[PDB]
Each structure stands twice: as C-alpha cells, then as structure tokens.
C-alpha cells in the first residue's frame, strides 16, 4: 500500500508537521515530521507547562488501549529537550496503523521547543537512535512489507520569500509513505547508497560545496544528516568561516548580538550556492539562503549556513535541513538503504 501525510508549514519554513492519531478513540495531533530523530512523542494532558495549556495534548486516561509505563522518557535535540514517560498505544498516520507503538508522553520541555498548533514530534530516522529503544512507526511499516515500494517521498513547500505568507500554512508539502510522487518530481532519482553501519540518522557524505563559484574546503568529508526537522544548515565553525569568506562583505554575528553562530552579508548580494551529493550539484535558491536582517543594520542579511560544533561522539558533522531540502524532491529508501534526490516538477 501507499499513504500520504499532508504537511503544514509552520514559522516560514521553520518546521513541517503532519497528523498523527493516537489511542482509542483516536486523539489527533500535529507533529513535526523529523528525519533527524527516531522517537514519537506527544505532550500529555497532565503537562503543566505553558505551551501544553495552549495546544492539544494526549489524555492517557481516555484511551482504552493505552498501556502505561513507569519507564522514563527523555530526548535531547539541538533546540532543547523533552521529558516524560513511555507509553504504548495504537497509532495511525497516512492510513496505516501500528497497534502497539511505544512513544513518549511528554510533560516537560526546555522553553520554546514546540508550541501551538504542534503537540509533539514524529521521528522518521532509524531505530538505533531512538531514545525510547522502540522501533519507529515508519520502520515497522517498511519492515512488514506493507509498502508498495520500501521508501518515503518528501516534498517541503517553500514560503520563505513570500511576503504575504502566514505563520501557519496548511498547504505545506507532502510525505508519501511507500513510494515517490511522480507528479512532484521530474527526471530520474539520484540515489546515494547508505551502508549497514550508517543506519542511524538518515545521512550521506557531502562531496563538495560551491559558493560564489568557489569550491569550499569541507575537510576527510563530512557525513550529513538530511534532516526535515532542522530549519537551516548546521556546519562546523571552521567550515562556516570558510563558507562566509567566499561572500564579499560577510561577517560573523558578534555574540553580544544574541546571534553567535550566525553570519550576515550584504542583503543585495544574491548568493549562488550548491551542495554536491552522489555526483550531482544541487542548488539552494536565494529565497532559502537569505533569511533577512537579524539586526537594525538593514543592509546586512543572515545566511542559512550556521556554525554548530558537534560532539565528537556524533557520527554527523553537518545537519542539512529544510533550507536545502526545499530545493529537491527527497527519497528516504529503506532497502537498499539510500537517500535519493530528484529535481522538483
């Protein structure tokens, strides 16, 4: 079978969310579709944080199929952490169901992790990085032979650069579970193979980067999480410095600014930039690259590449988020494990 998840684009391409249904009877939530993590969680109805009072929460007491656990749940993301306990219940998405899906019932987070209209997150990466130790929903479906083709197809719609865009755009893209949507891409899919040691994040090697016509030293090539739940493109500090050195007038934001790790450059410079994956260059549009002015200096605009130094325990050195992914149709293939890119239709 196949099934489609309609995406809502939140925060001007900040996050892309889909509908999950949990429990009996079904309780529905908008959750961030996150190819850079592997746990499902939702805010629980007992959660007393402010964001919980302002969004939809999961009431464990009114699901007849909920199986409680005392087991702690906690997960750490780049943007903060989420804590609570594990539970097990029936979960549906895209017309599919996993009957005894283990997931987090979250009752605290760091400030501003999520808010209305979101209630949680669905991890789309591999079991080995699931904090819960549970098989991800998608991975159960792929493994069970339920899909026409063992892959997920992803289209993230762009609102950055639309000056009349809203903070909630319900026409935000699509994830097709069990195939690729041929109306959304043109030509052939270029698959970059993922070996059996790399099934954690969805990650592939960066072959090269070109910015303003200059090939950047990306030094030993980085493994890149292709991450639908990251807004921008996170790279090592030394690499970010090299990137912005290719744009005339670019500078690091000070730290006093509140924007340490970000870089700004002349707003009237259109930046030509591409990343090379699997022997092909994939351009990033200027509407994705230019984030606008972060300070009162309106002549300077922030770039989509930011400095983020990774733990030396991390198998990824780049996090390649929506800023990139908006420019390609993306296939996350279970078997043979691969990430594919195609030109958008």
């Amino acid at each position: 079978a196949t099934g489609t998840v309609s995406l809502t684009d939140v925060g001007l391409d900040a996050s892309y969310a889909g509908q999950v249904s949990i429990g009996t009877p079904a309780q529905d939530f908008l959750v961030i579709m996150d190819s850079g993590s592997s746990d499902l969680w939702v805010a629980g109805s007992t959660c007393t944080e402010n964001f919980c009072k302002q969004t939809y929460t999961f009431d464990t007491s009114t699901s007849s199929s909920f199986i409680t656990s005392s087991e702690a749940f906690n997960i750490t993301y780049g943007s903060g952490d989420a804590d609570g306990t594990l539970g097990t219940d029936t979960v549906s998405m895209a017309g599919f169901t996993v009957s005894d899906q283990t997931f987090g019932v979250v009752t605290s987070t760091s400030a501003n992790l999520i808010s209305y209209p979101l209630s949680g997150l669905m991890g789309l990466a591999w079991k080995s990085i699931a904090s819960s130790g549970a098989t991800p929903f998608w991975q159960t479906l792929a493994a069970s032979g339920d899909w026409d083709s063992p892959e997920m197809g992803v289209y993230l719609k762009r609102y950055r650069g639309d000056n009349t865009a809203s903070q909630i755009e319900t026409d935000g893209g699509q994830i097709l579970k069990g195939g690729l949507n041929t109306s959304l891409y043109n030509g052939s899919v270029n698959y970059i193979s993922i070996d059996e040691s790399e099934k954690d994040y969805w990650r592939i090697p960066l072959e090269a980067m070109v910015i303003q016509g200059n090939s950047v030293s990306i030094a030993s090539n980085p493994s890149c999480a292709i991450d639908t739940g990251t807004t921008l493109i996170g790279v090592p500090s030394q690499t970010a410095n090299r990137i912005y050195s290719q744009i005339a007038g670019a500078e690091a934001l000070s730290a006093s600014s509140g924007y340490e790790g970000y870089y700004q450059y002349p707003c009237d410079t259109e930046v030509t930039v591409s990343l090379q994956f699997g022997g092909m260059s994939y351009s990033i549009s200027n509407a994705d690259m230019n984030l606008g002015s972060f300070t009162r200096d309106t002549s300077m605009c922030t770039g989509a590449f930011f400095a983020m130094d990774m733990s030396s325990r991390s198998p990824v050195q780049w996090i390649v988020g929506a800023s990139f992914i908006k420019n390609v149709y993306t296939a996350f293939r279970y078997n043979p494990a691969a990430i594919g890119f195609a030109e958008l239709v």
């Binding site: 996150d34 190819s35 993590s37 750490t76 993301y77 943007s79 739940g229 990251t230 996170g234 988020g321």
Partner: peptide
C-alpha cells in the same frame, strides 16, 4: 532556527 536528536 530549530534543530531536531542531540
């Protein structure tokens, strides 16, 4: 921006 695990 957000940056989704560690």
């Amino acid at each position: 921006x957000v940056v989704x695990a560690x």
